Design a protein around this ligand. Sequence first.
Ligand code: GLU
Length: 300
Amino acid sequence: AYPSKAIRVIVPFAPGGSTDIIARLVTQRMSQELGQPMVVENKGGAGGAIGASEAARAEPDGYTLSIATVSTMAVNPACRPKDLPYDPIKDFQPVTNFANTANVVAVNPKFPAKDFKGFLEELKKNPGKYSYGSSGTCGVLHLMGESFKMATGTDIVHVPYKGSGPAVADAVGGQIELIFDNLPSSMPQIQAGKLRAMAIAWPTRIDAIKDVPTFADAGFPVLNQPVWYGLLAPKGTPMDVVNKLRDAAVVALKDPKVIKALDDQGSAPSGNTPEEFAKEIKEQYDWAQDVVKKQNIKLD
Ligand SMILES: N[C@@H](CCC(=O)O)C(=O)O
């Protein structure tokens, strides 16, 4: 009876990004429930395409799973419409959305602005001179940066990384002045004062960082789109497996230490149904097609 051995969990991004952070937090606690190890494998590269394509080829037995991200479910498909080696919707069985997650635009603290208003002013006075990091060329944070540029009338230079892990460290080091990130990986640095957050993408301000406005507060509600992290199995994985995993996710997401960690990092638990997640996946997918194809926001 499932599970009788270790479950591989593929994270399609480098260590120390939000995918990796949330993946390890939630599967650690799921594992305790399932009575089998869940072993995280980081497979970063190409905005999540490398790792997602690999997860898509796995046998549908439930022992090779992967972390859904907006990069892998929505933006990569839209960025590489002819040659992406997986269909996000047809090649995966959704299990559950772990968490809804805030995005953030942050700066190195030497950046000469203290708020979003002066942030825009500074960028407008220097078109083409500042650069920003992302988690990859066909990922949600590259699309975030490009969306920002279009909506605010700014010109800032994209520098992709193998995930936000290495991006956060370059932004903290000053090798890039700006970073577009999912909040959890930037959260420790912001708390420590090593980055300054300009805006978050979230329905409201977040208690961890109460003084950072949302993009809607900043006067750019089109930019106020969060992301999410969830669990995927290959298409054809039995419902027995899906419901077992989802149940363990639901238990894990009620754990008060997991609730706190999610809260503190800039996320909120979901633990919704496979179908509710599939609907979220389709929403993001459709939105990325809209944004990239209509609206003329170029990724490559
Ligand atoms: N950009 C990824 C996460 C990046 C990372 O985990 O390093 C996303 O779609 O959520």
